[PDB]
């Protein structure tokens, strides 16, 4: 009779018809992704179309219930998730132009071919070739040529596209009762209506600043060490007092530093912990690798895999006749169906990725009791964070000695711990300032703090000021150097990696104090500990029904983002970097003295 019961019945109808127009969509996307054939293409297109039209009409019928008279928090949360307009609030012409713009950004990025001048008989694409020339080459001018040519072409072919894109997205966000499109993206962390756990859209940036102020010293030491090792790589071109040249970061954009392990090794005489030879000598196939990951997850106390998981998942590349996407992906199809699409090779990296994707599957499995619109992570960082903690725990030497991959006569001295921690720092701490810089630049360009004709001068200064990386040559506003990244060009939020990175080490500390680990954090294993598994599953079972602050207080006993776990993880690497940075100069100058 009241409005709330009307909302509950409407939400029940919506939840049923949707668990079904999704499992039909997810089954068709799965059949396309494991079998690339044109009938699978049209099946995925018709099901995606019927799913987008279903959510369009259900949001149209869902916006007839005002929210101010609903007191139950779960129904209010489901109706707030359902009533989001998306792109439907605009006129049809502007929405169609926006979808055309997004499609042509996707086609420009996917089919962007950049090659050598005067050799046009074939040319080289980004994903096959530019990644290889950025990750493998040691030539300064070759990387400079590839960097400047790709950035020049993509910037000249994307700058007016982004010029119209920012205006259309700003109009969409201001039509959606948001301040800007940056406010729309920060609205994912917004918590309203819960006393004590209230979180605003505006606080997150200063929270990020409060974390980054303590991030900045550790990264500085790593930067100095990398600079010293780059002094070994490049004698005269990089200045000791200045910032790093931009095309020397081992990737196309500088997002990851993991390609510098050969150049920046702490102790090259010590061997690595690569266990591929032990797997290939004993013929460890992928099925028993996933059985071993399941044994780890039942060792920690989480429920084991379903029978349909083992029946329906494709854990091996099928062959030449059937083409499939090689990207490792965990699929939650709904109706209790969980699969992993992964073309496994017999390596340690695929072993860690299998642990990561089974952590993803366990996270998807735990919130299956929630209603359909609450079946997600509490924020966008948690879902990847709970997989990265499994990738952390499976990589420890103790776990590899437990399961027979590592010999019992292996000596774990401090030097291999230092070089493992430096590899993890090049993977993890290196990407944090680039991510915070890119997201804060995008937030100011959506807010209008940055003027339209001052983008590149501001952006490079940010890269100078935050990341400590200087451009090779000055770039004017004919270029769009941000737009060369996959996520910004295809309308993806980027702060999820920063929040995932912090939540990863927060969760690692919470589980290692749950499991009573008496040493440093990087040598900790959560295996054979039931209380830590129960403490984790208390958070995994909530899903999106509770605020993420309450889930964080449930895990780590804190209600706010903390950087102390991250610096506590890298503490011996921090002391080592303080020891060997005595001769070098910590910090940078904003002058263009390197180049």
């Amino acid at each position: 009779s009241t409005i709330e019961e009307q909302a509950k019945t409407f939400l029940d109808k919506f939840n049923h018809e949707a668990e079904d127009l999704f499992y039909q969509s997810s089954l068709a996307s799965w059949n396309y992704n494991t079998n690339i054939t044109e009938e699978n293409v049209q099946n995925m297109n018709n099901a995606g179309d019927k799913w987008s039209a279903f959510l369009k009409e259900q949001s149209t019928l869902a916006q007839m219930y005002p929210l101010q008279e609903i007191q139950n928090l779960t129904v209010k949360l489901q109706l707030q998730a359902l009533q989001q307009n998306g792109s439907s609030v605009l006129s049809e012409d502007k929405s169609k132009r926006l979808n055309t713009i997004l499609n042509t950004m996707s086609t420009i990025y996917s089919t962007g071919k950049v090659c050598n001048p005067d050799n046009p008989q074939e040319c080289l694409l980004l994903e096959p070739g530019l990644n290889e020339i950025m990750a493998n080459s040691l030539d300064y001018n070759e990387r400079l040529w590839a960097w400047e040519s790709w950035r020049s072409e993509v910037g000249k072919q994307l700058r007016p596209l982004y010029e119209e894109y920012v205006v259309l997205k700003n109009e969409m966000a201001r039509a959606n009762h948001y301040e800007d499109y940056g406010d729309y993206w920060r609205g994912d962390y917004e918590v309203n209506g819960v006393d004590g756990y209230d979180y605003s859209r505006g606080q997150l940036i200063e929270d990020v600043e409060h974390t980054f102020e303590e991030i900045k010293p550790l990264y500085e030491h790593l930067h100095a060490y990398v600079r010293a090792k780059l002094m070994n790589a490049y004698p005269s071109y990089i200045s000791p007092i200045g910032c790093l040249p931009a095309h020397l970061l081992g990737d196309m954009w500088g997002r990851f530093w993991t390609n510098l392990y050969s150049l920046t090794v702490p102790f090259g005489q010590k061997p690595n912990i690569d266990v591929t030879d032990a797997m290939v000598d004993q013929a460890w196939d992928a099925q028993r690798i996933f059985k071993e990951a399941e044994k780890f997850f039942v060792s920690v106390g989480l429920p084991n895999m379903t029978q349909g998981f083992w029946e329906n998942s494709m854990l091996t590349d099928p062959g030449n006749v059937q083409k499939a996407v090689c990207h490792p992906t965990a699929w939650d199809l709904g109706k209790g169906d969980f699969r992993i699409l992964m073309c496994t090779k017999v390596t340690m990296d695929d072993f860690l990725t299998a642990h990561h994707e089974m952590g993803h599957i366990q996270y998807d499995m735990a919130y299956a009791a929630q209603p359909f619109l609450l079946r997600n992570g509490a924020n966008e960082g948690f879902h990847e964070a709970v997989g990265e903690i499994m990738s952390l725990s499976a990589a420890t030497p103790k776990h590899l000695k437990s399961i027979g991959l590592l010999s019992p006569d292996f000596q774990e001295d401090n030097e291999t711990e230092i070089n493992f921690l430096l590899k993890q720092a090049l993977t993890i701490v290196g990407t944090l300032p680039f991510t915070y810089m890119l997201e804060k630049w995008r937030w100011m360009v959506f807010k209008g703090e940055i003027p339209k004709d001052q983008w590149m001068k501001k952006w490079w200064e940010m890269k100078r000021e935050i990341v400590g990386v200087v451009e090779p040559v000055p770039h004017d506003e004919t270029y769009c150097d941000p737009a060369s990244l996959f996520h910004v060009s295809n309308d993806y939020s980027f702060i999820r990696y920063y929040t995932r990175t912090l939540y990863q080490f927060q969760f690692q500390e919470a589980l290692c104090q749950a499991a009573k680990h008496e040493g440093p954090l990087h040598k900790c294993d959560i295996s054979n500990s039931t209380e830590a598994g129960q403490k984790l599953f208390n958070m995994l079972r909530l899903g999106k029904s509770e605020p993420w602050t309450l889930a964080l207080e449930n895990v780590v006993g804190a209600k706010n983002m903390n950087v102390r776990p991250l610096l506590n993880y890298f503490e011996p690497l921090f002391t080592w970097l303080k020891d060997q940075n005595k001769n070098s100069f910590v910090g940078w100058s904003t002058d263009w003295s390197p180049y």
Binding site: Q6, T9, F10, D12, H16, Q24, Q307, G308, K335, D337
Partner: protein, 201 residues
């Protein structure tokens, strides 16, 4: 003496098609010999939850009438065919009394009741104005009014069709696979009880 005239449990258990849970089939069983030892000794019949009578002594106690209610539900709602539970099945489709004298039998039928396209021949009622009386069957298709304006038979705003469909597929989890459920209810009346088990020589 020499026994014959077995009760027709093969037409109930080994039927090709079961009814929906909203229109659950009721078969009366009378004046025959009821061998319950077959049902206990079949391993595919996983769940043999018997209430109000022990399964070991089912073969000796004789009853007046046996009611076999047969339907198909999902895996997660098998536990709702029991006294004192609540949910969509207990409130709106099939309600058991608290003083229930009889056993329930449920088994997985994913190989029979699931199709790759999906099975839509099985329906359950999702919305009813009032909770059901025990052993009441409601086959009405009247439009459910959740709001204030009259529906007038048109499924528009705040007017929903009360019957949805279980889209059984052979690729669903154990909680969504089709489970065939047969509920045997044993009743005693002032009449001479003529449904009894066999006697040993």
């Amino acid at each position: 003496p020499n026994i014959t005239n077995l009760c027709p449990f093969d037409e109930v258990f080994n039927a090709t098609r079961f009814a929906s849970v909203y229109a659950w089939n009721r078969k009366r069983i009378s004046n025959c010999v009821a061998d319950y030892s077959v049902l206990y000794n079949l391993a595919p019949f996983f769940t043999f939850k018997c209430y109000g009578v022990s399964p070991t002594k089912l073969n000796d106690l004789c009853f007046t009438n046996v009611y076999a209610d047969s339907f198909v539900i999902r895996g997660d709602e098998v536990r709702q065919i029991a006294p004192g539970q609540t949910g969509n099945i207990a409130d709106y489709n099939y309600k058991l009394p608290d003083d229930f004298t009889g056993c329930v039998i449920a088994w997985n039928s994913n190989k029979l009741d699931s199709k790759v396209s999906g099975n839509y021949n099985y329906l359950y009622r999702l919305f009813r104005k009032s909770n059901l009386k025990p052993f009441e069957r409601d086959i009405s298709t009247e439009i459910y009014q959740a709001g204030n304006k009259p529906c007038n038979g048109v499924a528009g705003f705040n007017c929903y069709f009360p019957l949805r469909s279980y889209s059984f597929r052979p690729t669903y989890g154990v909680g969504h696979q089709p489970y065939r459920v047969v509920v045997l209810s044993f009743e005693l009346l002032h009449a001479p009880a003529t449904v009894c088990g066999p006697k040993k020589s």
